[PDB]
Amino acid sequence: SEESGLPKLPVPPLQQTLATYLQCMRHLVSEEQFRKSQAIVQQFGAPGGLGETLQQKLLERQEKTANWVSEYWLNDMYLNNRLALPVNSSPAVIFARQHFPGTDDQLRFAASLISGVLSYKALLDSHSIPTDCAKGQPLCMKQYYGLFSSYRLPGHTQDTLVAQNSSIMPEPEHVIVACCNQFFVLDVVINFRRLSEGDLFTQLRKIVKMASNAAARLPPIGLLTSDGRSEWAEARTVLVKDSTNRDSLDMIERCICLVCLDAPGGVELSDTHRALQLLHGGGYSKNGANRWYDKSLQFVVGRDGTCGVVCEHSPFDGIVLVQCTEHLLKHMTQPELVRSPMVPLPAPRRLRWKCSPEIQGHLASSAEKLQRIVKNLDFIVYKFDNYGKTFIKKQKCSPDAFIQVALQLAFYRLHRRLVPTYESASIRRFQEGRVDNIRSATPEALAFVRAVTDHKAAVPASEKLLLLKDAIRAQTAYTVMAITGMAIDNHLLALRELARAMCAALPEMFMDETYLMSNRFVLSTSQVPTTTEMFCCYGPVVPNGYGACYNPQPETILFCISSFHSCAATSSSKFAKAVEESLIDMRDLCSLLPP
Numbered sequence: 307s308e309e310s311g312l313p314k315l316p317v318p319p320l321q322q323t324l325a326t327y328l329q330c331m332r333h334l335v336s337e338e339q340f341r342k343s344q345a346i347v348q349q350f351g352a353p354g355g356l357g358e359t360l361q362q363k364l365l366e367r368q369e370k371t372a373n374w375v376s377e378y379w380l381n382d383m384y385l386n387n388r389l390a391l392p393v394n395s396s397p398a399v400i401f402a403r404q405h406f407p408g409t410d411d412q413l414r415f416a417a418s419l420i421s422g423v424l425s426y427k428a429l430l431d432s433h434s435i436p437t438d439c440a441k442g443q444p445l446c447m448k449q450y451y452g453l454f455s456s457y458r459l460p461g462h463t464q465d466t467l468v469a470q471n472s473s474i475m476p477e478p479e480h481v482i483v484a485c486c487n488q489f490f491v492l493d494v495v496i497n498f499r500r501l502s503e504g505d506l507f508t509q510l511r512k513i514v515k516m517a518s519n520a521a522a523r524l525p526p527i528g529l530l531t532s533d534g535r536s537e538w539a540e541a542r543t544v545l546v547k548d549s550t551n552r553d554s555l556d557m558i559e560r561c562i563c564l565v566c567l568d569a570p571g572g573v574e575l576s577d578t579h580r581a582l583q584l585l586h587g588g589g590y591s592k593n594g595a596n597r598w599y600d601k602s603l604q605f606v607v608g609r610d611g612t613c614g615v616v617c618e619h620s621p622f623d624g625i626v627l628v629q630c631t632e633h634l635l636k637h638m639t640q641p642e643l644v645r646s647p648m649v650p651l652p653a654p655r656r657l658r659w660k661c662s663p664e665i666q667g668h669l670a671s672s673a674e675k676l677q678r679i680v681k682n683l684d685f686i687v688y689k690f691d692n693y694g695k696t697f698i699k700k701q702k703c704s705p706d707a708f709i710q711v712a713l714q715l716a717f718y719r720l721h722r723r724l725v726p727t728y729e730s731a732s733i734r735r736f737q738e739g740r741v742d743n744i745r746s747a748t749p750e751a752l753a754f755v756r757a758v759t760d761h762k763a764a765v766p767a768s769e770k771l772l773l774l775k776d777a778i779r780a781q782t783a784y785t786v787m788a789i790t791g792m793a794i795d796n797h798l799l800a801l802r803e804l805a806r807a808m809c810a811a812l813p814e815m816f817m818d819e820t821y822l823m824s825n826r827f828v829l830s831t832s833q834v835p836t837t838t839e840m841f842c843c844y845g846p847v848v849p850n851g852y853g854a855c856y857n858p859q860p861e862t863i864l865f866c867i868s869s870f871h872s873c874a875a876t877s878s879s880k881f882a883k884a885v886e887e888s889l890i891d892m893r894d895l896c897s898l899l900p901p
């Protein structure tokens with residue numbers, strides 16, 4: 307064995323992708339532009355043309371690599387993005403509201419949570435995590451091994467995702483505890499010896515005590531990691547000039563994860579508000595500096611009861627993240643384990659920093675930059691409570707396809723147009739499989755939303771229902787296509803970069819405005835279903851777009867909607883309202899008679 311038995315990501319046929327591509331964009335661009343894109347595409351895919359040359363190189367690439375899109379995808383989707391990670395990239399998972407009468411209640415939670423993480427990592431490292439099935443065939447489990455051994459280094463133009471070697475798994479293993487913007491190294495596993503939940507508690511207390519010492523308070527360096535990727539790369543480059551900083555950064559780069567003991571939030575603890583703290587900490591004046599974004603998992607345990615985890619996206623996606631998080635939470639449910647006695651307990655070490663005039667300048671900039679993000683985010687947690695999966699399945703529809711169609715109607719009734727839409731589609735069936743795109747703004751959806759919104763047309767409800775079902779069928783069809791690696795985004799990306807390798811001047815096929823527009827997801831979505839009382843959320847991917855993450859339950863559907871206040875067009879409240887009306891309209895449509 308020693309090598310995956312899983313299938314390699316397939317390379318869809320050239321003509322299939324080009325035809326689907328055109329079919330996807332026809333209704334999203336003018337007729338004049340579409341007419342030009344048809345010719346451009348026709349020339350790119352012609353017999354003996356450039357497209358076939360690139361296709362052959364891709365087939366060669368498919369043969370020489372475990373996954374032909376991994377590199378291109380990782381860079382295109384995240385490592386090349388220059389936007390600051392908060393809101394723009396790193397999603398957050400909000401746990402249920404906790405009640406911490408005292409600080410020791412907060413600490414005991416953190417201790418229990420840290421314990422859960424150690425136990426989970428043990429399962430991971432012992433390869434005891436049950437291989438996931440495609441809801442089915444085996445799924446790639448590589449993402450799991452990137453949960454605690456990943457760090458994302460900033461770059462001037464391209465970031466670097468660092469994966470720690472197994473042989474280089476530190477001894478002992480440690481977590482970084484963030485408190486009052488101060489970072490402390492907390493060793494948790496010496497010689498296979500895992501710190502007891504009781505010792506972790508004791509260590510956390512020492513950390514809270516030290517973090518509260520003004521004479522030792524250091525600059526809030528974590529604030530720098532909340533800035534644009536090129537900005538952070540520059541500031542980090544300054545830091546690295548000194549030996550003390552290199553040592554501190556290294557400890558952070560090699561920790562298992564961060565545990566953020568956030569200060570109380572000066573606002574009510576509604577789901578929406580808790581989600582905001584988890585997304586950007588509320589800015590420097592709050593907990594915005596009590597973070598370190600490059601690290602994959604940042605578990606937040608707020609003094610006031612606001613808990614959850616901030617996730618860096620480059621290493622793994624939402625499904626794996628949820629499996630982990632729900633396992634931890636469930637483990638915190640199971641009675642406290644036995645083994646917990648140990649004696650000589652060294653005090654946690656505070657990470658030192660060698661400041662300077664420069665760094666102070668970078669700190670001020672980052673604080674201002676992060677403030678713009680906090681002020682620009684328009685976020686809302688809307689809970690649709692009229693129905694959920696149960697009602698939907700009774701309509702012979704996949705809940706996901708049904709919701710994806712509702713989102714299209716919501717966007718159309720509000721903005722009067724459909725836009726290139728993104729929906730994550732897992733391709734974990736294939737080696738190193740991450741995701742591909744499900745383009746939900748289909749031609750069927752357009753016909754459906756138009757029939758619904760065009761009062762003048764006076765389309766009979768019975769006809770609206772047929773259009774509804776056809777849109778849901780088209781959504782399900784594209785979904786199946788994407789997850790079986792037969793979609794088009796990854797395919798076009800690879801053809802694009804292989805071309806770039808040949809000549810920096812990309813083919814007209816990719817310089818075409820239709821192509822550029824097709825990848826500006828004004829509506830970016832994903833379904834992150836949970837069984838616990840937690841939810842995932844994230845920001846939009848373009849200035850004029852939304853970020854819609856839904857969690858469908860048997861009788862309700864949770865919708866986390868984001869957009870930017872800077873764009874006068876978008877409005878999370880109005881979109882959430884449009885979603886409600888669409889789900890109601892769809893229910894009424896499905897509740898009609900036959901013939």
Ligand SMILES: C[N+](C)(C)CCO
Binds near residue numbers: 397624728729830844
């Ligand atoms: C924001 N996206 C939908 C692109 C990714 C969520 O996993």
